[PDB]
Amino acid sequence: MIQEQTMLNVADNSGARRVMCIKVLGGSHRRYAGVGDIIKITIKEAIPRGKVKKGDVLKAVVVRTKKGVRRPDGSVIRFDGNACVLLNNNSEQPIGTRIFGPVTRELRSEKFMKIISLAPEV
Amino acid sequence: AVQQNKPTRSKRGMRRSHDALTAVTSLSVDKTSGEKHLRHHITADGYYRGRKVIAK
Amino acid sequence: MRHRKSGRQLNRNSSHRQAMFRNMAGSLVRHEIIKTTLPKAKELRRVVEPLITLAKTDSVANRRLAFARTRDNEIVAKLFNELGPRFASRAGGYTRILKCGFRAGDNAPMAYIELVDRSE
Amino acid sequence: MIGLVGKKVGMTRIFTEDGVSIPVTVIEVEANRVTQVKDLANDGYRAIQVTTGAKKANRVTKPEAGHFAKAGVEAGRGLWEFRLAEGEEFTVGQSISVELFADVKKVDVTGTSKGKGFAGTVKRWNFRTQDATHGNSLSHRVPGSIGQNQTPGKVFKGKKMAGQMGNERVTVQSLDVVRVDAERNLLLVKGAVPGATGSDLIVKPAVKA
Amino acid sequence: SNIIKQLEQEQMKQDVPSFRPGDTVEVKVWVVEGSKKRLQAFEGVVIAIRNRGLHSAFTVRKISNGEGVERVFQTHSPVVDSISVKRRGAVRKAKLYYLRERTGKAARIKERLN
RNA sequence: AGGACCGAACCGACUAAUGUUGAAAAAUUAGCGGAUGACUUGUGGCUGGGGGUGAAAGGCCAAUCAAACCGGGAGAUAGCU
RNA sequence: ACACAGGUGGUCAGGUAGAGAAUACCAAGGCGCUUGAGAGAACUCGGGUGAAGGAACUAGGCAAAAUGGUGCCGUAACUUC
RNA sequence: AAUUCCUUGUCGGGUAAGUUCCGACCUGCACGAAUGGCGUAAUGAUGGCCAGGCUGUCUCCACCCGAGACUCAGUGAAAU
RNA sequence: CGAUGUCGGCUCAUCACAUCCUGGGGCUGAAGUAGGUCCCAAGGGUAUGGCUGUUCGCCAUUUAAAGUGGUACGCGAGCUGGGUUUAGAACGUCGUGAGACAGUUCGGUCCCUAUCUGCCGUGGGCGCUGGAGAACUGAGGGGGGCUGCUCCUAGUACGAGAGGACCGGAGUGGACGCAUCACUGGUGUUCGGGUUGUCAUGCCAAUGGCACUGCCCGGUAGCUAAAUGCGGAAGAGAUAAGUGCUGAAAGCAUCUAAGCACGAAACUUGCCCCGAGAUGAGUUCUCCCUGACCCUUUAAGGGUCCUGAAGGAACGUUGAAGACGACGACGUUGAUAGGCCGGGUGUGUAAGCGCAGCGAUGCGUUGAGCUAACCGGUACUAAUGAACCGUGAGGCUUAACCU
Ligand SMILES: [Mg+2]
Ligand SMILES: [Mg+2]
Ligand SMILES: [Mg+2]
Ligand SMILES: [Mg+2]
Ligand SMILES: [Mg+2]
Ligand SMILES: [Mg+2]
Ligand SMILES: [Mg+2]
Ligand SMILES: [Mg+2]
Ligand SMILES: [Mg+2]
Ligand SMILES: [Mg+2]
Ligand SMILES: [Mg+2]
Ligand SMILES: [Mg+2]
Ligand SMILES: [Mg+2]
Ligand SMILES: [Mg+2]
Ligand SMILES: [Mg+2]
Ligand SMILES: [Mg+2]
Ligand SMILES: [Mg+2]
Ligand SMILES: [Mg+2]
Ligand SMILES: [Mg+2]
Ligand SMILES: [Mg+2]
Ligand SMILES: [Mg+2]
Ligand SMILES: [Mg+2]
Ligand SMILES: [Mg+2]
Ligand SMILES: [Mg+2]
Ligand SMILES: [Mg+2]
Ligand SMILES: [Mg+2]
Ligand SMILES: [Mg+2]
Ligand SMILES: [Mg+2]
Ligand SMILES: [Mg+2]
Ligand SMILES: [Mg+2]
Ligand SMILES: [Mg+2]
Ligand SMILES: [Mg+2]
Ligand SMILES: [Mg+2]
Ligand SMILES: [Mg+2]
Ligand SMILES: [Mg+2]
Ligand SMILES: [Mg+2]
Ligand SMILES: [Mg+2]
Ligand SMILES: [Mg+2]
Ligand SMILES: [Mg+2]
Ligand SMILES: [Mg+2]
Ligand SMILES: [Mg+2]
Ligand SMILES: [Mg+2]
Ligand SMILES: [Mg+2]
Ligand SMILES: [Mg+2]
Ligand SMILES: [Mg+2]
Ligand SMILES: [Mg+2]
Ligand SMILES: [Mg+2]
Ligand SMILES: [Mg+2]
Ligand SMILES: [Mg+2]
Ligand SMILES: [Mg+2]
Ligand SMILES: [Mg+2]
Ligand SMILES: [Mg+2]
Ligand SMILES: [Mg+2]
Ligand SMILES: [Mg+2]
Ligand SMILES: [Mg+2]
Ligand SMILES: [Mg+2]
Ligand SMILES: [Mg+2]
Ligand SMILES: [Mg+2]
Ligand SMILES: [Mg+2]
């Protein structure tokens, strides 16, 4: 799903475009993380103006995945790519002020209500 | 991997104890032809369960 | 593992199996009786009886289907003309198998397989 | 405690009003008739033997027919036994039904799992396959090492090897019960149960609960 | 499997419109909430259908904000509520998985005239 | 025009797997290099052992080479097993 | 050493597609390789497909996967031009 | 450095992390000018390093198609 | 030394406790949180990468923790071959030289069909004292036992503040294990379709063979994980360190000498599985056999005839059972397999004909035709009248009764 060495697109105006997962946080030997799970990433593209630069190491939350989420309804929701929203290393708060593309209900938790509010759909 | 000691005729026979054959001890007869035949098989003449197979 | 599967390999690949069954079905249709191994006859049932069921109804499309599945105008014509009406009212079970001992060259179980009516 | 014997019909789903799909396993639990009652005097334990019907007559041997002649006069596929706890309920010819599970919320469900026959290493013990390239010589699914050296000089008992897998009784330990419908001999339990369709199984109220 | 069949009929629905692959449908999904239950619209092209009685399902691709966003609905579920057809495309295929890599202007489907 | 280029026959033998009481006392399968030249190949001839030949590896000289094979001195000698 | 998956010089060489003596299917012609019959288990060998990830494997991208044709356009540093 | 023991020398670049690699420093244990010195376009089944694509190499294996292995009939070895 | 293959890695492990995490305690220069040190405790658990041949090591980034050691520095008749002790070549250095370096550098054949012990599975024989079919008891053995975070108690106890609990409840995760295909997916060379080259069926049309299943798109059943259900417990007994009550020796004191009470993931049990070859061979229910005669060295003696039960085996149709055995269902008083009928599923509008168009092609008949393993039915085919094995009332002594 989302594991180490996985390349993710960026879904906020932080100016990173491409990031790489370097660790799946939470628990020992954990293999991969799904939607709504914090992971450790490193910047790879870092457009010029931006708010971050190449080589930075910080947090991120997966918002879209190609595998999707099932949940009790029995339905599935797949996407065409893997995307994440960069978070502050310590405060774990979003860095960008914009959200691009749809999000999914698993982000409804208290910790990501700002992402839910800023998301254009769902 | 090869033997380190030559095994005995006793061990040879003990191993072969399970190699004995078994006889059919079951030869059914056809009420018409009267021939003894293997069960559920046609007769050497061409009969089975009274009827004459291999014919019109 | 084999669970609820059907059809046996006969130690052949798919193309060889299909060609062998086509030839055997043609031979059985032509001769009305053949000598073969028991598993081979048990498999040949499932290939030959459907052909007779198809021949039950006569139409150009059915002729073309039978020709596609047999590739022999001789036995295709023998169907739809002789084996069709001969059974007509019989619902399945057009062939019977009878064990006939073992084969001298390799001790393989042998069995005759023939049409039930037996040309009567 | 008192349980019942049923047949695995298959798996299906139930949709709730709140948009939740529960996967259930259908268990057909026909009437179970008591054929014998064990007590502490004749035997040393208190239990009851039960049977489920639907068996033909010509396949019943004289000993079994004589055993059934004890106020059961009805053959069944087999005989099962349940240890009887306190309470001392009516025993002989009671014909317990599926209504017994109209109040329990958990069940264990015991049955014989599917038979693999071969197991094999890797598949049987979740062993890790060795590499596929980089020189590996004819050793991909093989187990590897099975002992240390001359010091032990042998292989220990219980070593994980290739053998038979499946085709043995297993319990699932406190499944949830969804619906217990009468007039149809049906018992719906959430989740999967061991065995194949049409196989017999023993339903028994959960002991952990 | 008479028992299972009769169990499934009790939940099978009787208001499923006849929609075909390649048609654009509009699905009203229930959005469960504490006390704010309401419908939500989902429009897209039907790229796959699975007919299994009570276990029937179908996939709809919405292509929103540059990403495909597919969605697999269970036909006989109380969450689907209602479904309607808006277009009738001609595709002469059962599965339209090539639309995943097609995208662009090539992702359009000619309408089926009748 | 080219000790030019890509690539069959042809001549080689860089990688992997198999084989290792082999189908084979060095081979098979898939890839790989040269392929008008210092090229490759058929037939015949010459160079003979402290010698030959060697774009050199102590390589090759009849499945044997830091001194070929056959016969003889010869029952060499062996404070060793 | 074998009725041995090896080696052995020359000549002839058709049709369709193809630049072609490559490759595919065929003609003339010649063959099915001197143990079989069943089953459809681990494991080995030779292959096909694979969700998400895409070198994290490993001494090493070993092996696999991938590129691959004709015509036209277009093509950098450096250079013995 | 195909040469440097101390040594993974120090600095810079690359990575997230680089005993390898590239550019410098000069304290050259123990470079050096036909046992040639320093460069060099082209070439290489040559050694080292990096990137794109690609993938069952791998997370982590799953299924399938054939040849053996297994059973029946015939023949019938070997090291020890 | 008439051969015990050496470093590292992979796979698979098992033991010790001088305990890394989790568990229980004493002391603290322990206010709380968080720490230090010592005692008891081995049930379970105990990281992925970058660099190097590298075990180690440094670094990045996690975890409750990333324990220390033994096992031929465990493990090459399990794998690898990077380092390292063959042959090629080069650098520096030493030597006049052949050559050498425990200096560096590029390249460089890893054999074995398992006899015995051992281990993982699965069978045959006999025994268990008339024979047979079932259900059990349970001596004994094995499996399992991990843990994070969030919320309430409570912003409470504690503190000047910052900060922030023990005890007790609820929820949701990581890793691991068992089961199962209802769902989401993989596969599906046995189903449908598209298409390239070429050959053939006299030709058109329509089909088949070959080219990796020619290439490719979908996909039934089955098997499957990534998919979804469950698990680890609570409780009880006896304890370790420790804490005690009462109480003398020793007028006091003292947890101990007599007596009594608490006390941990360790121990026994509780949970799951195997289990009467448990030769100590156990228990319960049911079923079957109750005819004559001869001989001898006269006792668990031999033999002739009659008899052949319960049941078993064999054979056949087979299975979500299986290497073969074994195990399960069925054998005409039958749905066991095949076929057939209907349905379902998959594919996607068959052939022929008609119309439009110069033609490729399109439209109607038409959601058509075909459709494996699936579902519900159906004796059409194959499962035979029989034969075979297994017997004829079951030893002695003693104890309690009937005589
Ligand atoms: Mg010896
Ligand atoms: Mg079947
Ligand atoms: Mg064979
Ligand atoms: Mg083919
Ligand atoms: Mg099975
Ligand atoms: Mg592994
Ligand atoms: Mg090898
Ligand atoms: Mg040239
Ligand atoms: Mg060339
Ligand atoms: Mg070589
Ligand atoms: Mg070759
Ligand atoms: Mg060249
Ligand atoms: Mg030399
Ligand atoms: Mg030689
Ligand atoms: Mg000499
Ligand atoms: Mg002399
Ligand atoms: Mg001598
Ligand atoms: Mg001496
Ligand atoms: Mg030959
Ligand atoms: Mg030859
Ligand atoms: Mg030649
Ligand atoms: Mg196979
Ligand atoms: Mg393989
Ligand atoms: Mg492949
Ligand atoms: Mg496919
Ligand atoms: Mg993949
Ligand atoms: Mg993919
Ligand atoms: Mg990529
Ligand atoms: Mg690694
Ligand atoms: Mg390669
Ligand atoms: Mg390739
Ligand atoms: Mg060095
Ligand atoms: Mg790298
Ligand atoms: Mg440098
Ligand atoms: Mg020099
Ligand atoms: Mg000079
Ligand atoms: Mg063999
Ligand atoms: Mg044999
Ligand atoms: Mg011999
Ligand atoms: Mg020796
Ligand atoms: Mg201790
Ligand atoms: Mg315990
Ligand atoms: Mg070692
Ligand atoms: Mg060790
Ligand atoms: Mg060993
Ligand atoms: Mg080793
Ligand atoms: Mg080496
Ligand atoms: Mg244990
Ligand atoms: Mg299914
Ligand atoms: Mg699928
Ligand atoms: Mg096909
Ligand atoms: Mg044509
Ligand atoms: Mg042909
Ligand atoms: Mg051909
Ligand atoms: Mg306890
Ligand atoms: Mg006192
Ligand atoms: Mg049937
Ligand atoms: Mg349909
Ligand atoms: Mg067609």
Side-chain angles (χ1 to χ4, degrees):
Chain A
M1 294 42 175
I2 305 296
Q3 57 185 3
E4 271 143 65
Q5 305 284 303
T6 296
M7 292 294 296
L8 292 121
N9 290 311
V10 178
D12 62 345
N13 64 327
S14 46
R17 299 292 179 273
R18 298 291 276 168
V19 294
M20 194 198 222
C21 178
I22 59 168
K23 184 66 66 173
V24 176
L25 304 177
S28 168
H29 274 298
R30 188 166 179 176
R31 292 189 180 79
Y32 39 56
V35 159
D37 285 316
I38 308 303
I39 52 138
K40 198 86 177 185
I41 60 96
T42 172
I43 309 301
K44 291 292 182 178
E45 217 143 290
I47 56 103
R49 166 64 172 282
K51 303 179 183 63
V52 304
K53 42 187 53 36
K54 226 175 74 149
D56 279 3
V57 177
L58 58 156
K59 303 287 185 63
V61 59
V62 195
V63 295
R64 295 195 291 273
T65 56
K66 292 200 40 163
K67 278 223 90 204
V69 313
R70 303 284 308 284
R71 295 296 160 186
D73 293 359
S75 318
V76 196
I77 310 178
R78 295 189 296 272
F79 299 94
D80 267 15
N82 314 277
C84 61
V85 175
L86 305 190
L87 304 176
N88 183 267
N89 222 10
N90 328 288
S91 62
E92 303 246 26
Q93 284 314 90
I95 301 173
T97 36
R98 304 274 301 286
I99 302 289
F100 301 99
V103 300
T104 197
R105 270 193 110 64
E106 302 44 39
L107 282 298
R108 179 69 50 147
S109 146
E110 172 26 83
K111 327 133 199 160
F112 315 114
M113 272 318 336
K114 218 158 316 313
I115 305 198
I116 280 279
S117 300
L118 280 160
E121 172 175 287
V122 171
Chain B
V2 68
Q3 82 206 349
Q4 248 193 41
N5 297 94
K6 175 182 173 179
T8 41
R9 56 184 69 84
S10 180
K11 296 309 207 223
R12 183 182 57 192
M14 275 153 36
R15 176 179 66 242
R16 293 179 183 175
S17 64
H18 292 283
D19 292 343
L21 301 178
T22 85
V24 298
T25 179
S26 306
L27 291 178
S28 51
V29 295
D30 218 26
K31 78 262 190 173
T32 299
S33 87
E35 306 169 87
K36 269 209 269 72
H37 69 91
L38 208 72
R39 197 167 184 73
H40 293 102
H41 289 56
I42 65 175
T43 308
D45 210 328
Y47 288 67
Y48 181 65
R49 300 180 69 174
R51 311 208 317 87
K52 200 267 186 302
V53 175
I54 306 110
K56 295 190 293 185
Chain C
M1 74 231 62
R2 191 200 68 74
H3 278 6
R4 288 306 212 68
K5 296 198 198 178
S6 41
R8 55 195 74 180
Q9 188 191 138
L10 287 322
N11 300 271
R12 294 174 169 80
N13 55 279
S14 207
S15 283
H16 189 181
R17 218 163 30 239
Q18 255 216 327
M20 192 197 40
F21 284 146
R22 189 173 292 179
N23 286 354
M24 220 185 287
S27 289
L28 174 54
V29 170
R30 154 169 321 106
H31 293 278
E32 266 145 305
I33 189 183
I34 57 173
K35 211 206 217 323
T36 181
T37 66
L38 187 47
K40 281 183 188 172
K42 289 192 179 180
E43 280 323 290
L44 176 64
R45 287 187 303 181
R46 307 177 65 225
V47 161
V48 86
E49 301 191 353
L51 272 168
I52 299 165
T53 280
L54 169 78
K56 217 72 82 63
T57 304
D58 190 352
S59 64
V60 179
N62 283 2
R63 296 295 187 96
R64 305 218 154 153
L65 257 163
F67 185 69
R69 304 195 172 145
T70 61
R71 302 296 300 185
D72 181 17
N73 286 318
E74 188 206 350
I75 76 102
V76 166
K78 184 171 186 178
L79 300 177
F80 302 92
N81 299 332
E82 322 191 26
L83 262 48
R86 270 165 71 178
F87 297 113
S89 57
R90 184 184 296 275
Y94 310 107
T95 54
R96 60 159 61 91
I97 290 155
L98 312 152
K99 284 81 127 187
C100 54
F102 302 87
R103 186 158 64 180
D106 48 5
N107 211 66
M110 305 295 305
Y112 293 103
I113 181 172
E114 55 143 11
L115 317 177
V116 295
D117 63 7
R118 200 180 292 181
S119 183
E120 302 179 2
Chain D
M1 107 177 72
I2 180 61
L4 295 178
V5 180
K7 213 204 285 273
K8 183 179 178 182
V9 182
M11 282 208 66
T12 179
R13 90 211 297 199
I14 294 176
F15 291 101
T16 70
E17 270 71 88
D18 40 336
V20 179
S21 183
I22 308 172
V24 301
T25 305
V26 183
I27 302 171
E28 200 203 355
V29 181
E30 307 183 280
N32 297 172
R33 290 97 61 184
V34 183
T35 53
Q36 160 165 18
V37 190
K38 321 246 184 134
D39 68 317
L40 272 243
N42 200 22
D43 306 82
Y45 66 113
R46 282 194 23 165
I48 61 166
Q49 195 200 38
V50 305
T51 185
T52 301
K55 172 171 201 43
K56 46 172 47 178
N58 87 286
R59 287 286 183 179
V60 180
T61 63
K62 291 180 66 53
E64 286 215 293
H67 181 66
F68 289 117
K70 297 295 192 65
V73 294
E74 272 324 306
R77 327 199 280 267
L79 307 170
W80 296 264
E81 204 161 333
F82 294 91
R83 303 294 297 269
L84 206 69
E86 304 297 345
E88 187 61 14
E89 293 75 357
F90 195 89
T91 61
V92 174
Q94 185 168 217
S95 183
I96 301 92
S97 65
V98 70
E99 316 295 5
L100 180 99
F101 292 147
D103 260 356
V104 304
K105 323 206 55 43
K106 300 286 187 63
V107 289
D108 288 326
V109 189
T110 307
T112 300
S113 59
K114 287 183 177 295
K116 271 87 178 138
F118 86 92
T121 323
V122 181
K123 161 152 169 98
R124 191 188 183 181
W125 301 111
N126 321 321
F127 281 12
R128 309 276 56 106
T129 292
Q130 286 159 69
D131 73 354
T133 57
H134 301 287
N136 194 303
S137 254
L138 310 172
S139 305
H140 309 276
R141 319 267 297 185
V142 304
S145 187
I146 59 175
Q148 291 78 260
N149 212 321
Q150 187 220 113
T151 280
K154 70 176 191 296
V155 182
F156 295 135
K157 272 248 180 35
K159 186 68 181 64
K160 288 159 159 42
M161 294 194 161
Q164 174 77 24
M165 182 186 219
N167 205 22
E168 59 205 30
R169 89 186 271 140
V170 305
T171 306
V172 169
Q173 277 289 122
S174 99
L175 278 177
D176 202 78
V177 60
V178 174
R179 178 131 48 79
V180 53
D181 167 288
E183 290 56 78
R184 303 220 280 264
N185 314 329
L186 280 200
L187 179 66
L188 308 184
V189 302
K190 179 180 179 179
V193 308
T197 301
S199 56
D200 314 331
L201 45 77
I202 296 121
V203 185
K204 202 166 20 174
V207 54
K208 298 290 183 63
Chain E
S1 300
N2 292 326
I3 302 166
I4 304 298
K5 309 206 118 73
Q6 177 261 40
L7 279 167
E8 316 257 59
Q9 320 309 34
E10 297 171 2
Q11 335 194 60
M12 294 266 294
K13 298 200 295 195
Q14 339 285 342
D15 58 329
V16 169
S18 211
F19 59 90
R20 267 168 73 154
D23 303 0
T24 79
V25 305
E26 166 41 353
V27 201
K28 306 308 202 45
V29 159
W30 281 114
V31 178
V32 180
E33 185 52 289
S35 301
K36 297 288 183 66
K37 180 180 179 177
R38 38 78 180 200
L39 293 308
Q40 167 168 130
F42 190 90
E43 240 176 44
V45 167
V46 177
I47 58 170
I49 302 174
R50 200 221 189 202
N51 305 275
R52 295 289 203 299
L54 178 72
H55 309 291
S56 298
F58 63 99
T59 317
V60 185
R61 184 176 171 84
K62 178 175 180 65
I63 174 49
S64 173
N65 297 3
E67 38 272 13
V69 47
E70 256 149 47
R71 178 70 176 278
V72 181
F73 300 93
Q74 318 291 270
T75 309
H76 305 280
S77 179
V79 185
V80 168
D81 185 67
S82 66
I83 182 175
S84 58
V85 183
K86 309 246 163 299
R87 267 267 315 271
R88 281 198 323 272
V91 295
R92 72 185 299 191
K93 211 100 157 201
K95 303 294 186 300
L96 286 65
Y97 295 146
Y98 60 88
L99 298 178
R100 284 160 187 179
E101 337 195 4
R102 201 78 136 207
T103 184
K105 299 285 226 147
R108 294 165 321 169
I109 295 126
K110 54 206 226 63
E111 208 242 353
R112 189 166 70 261
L113 274 35
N114 303 93

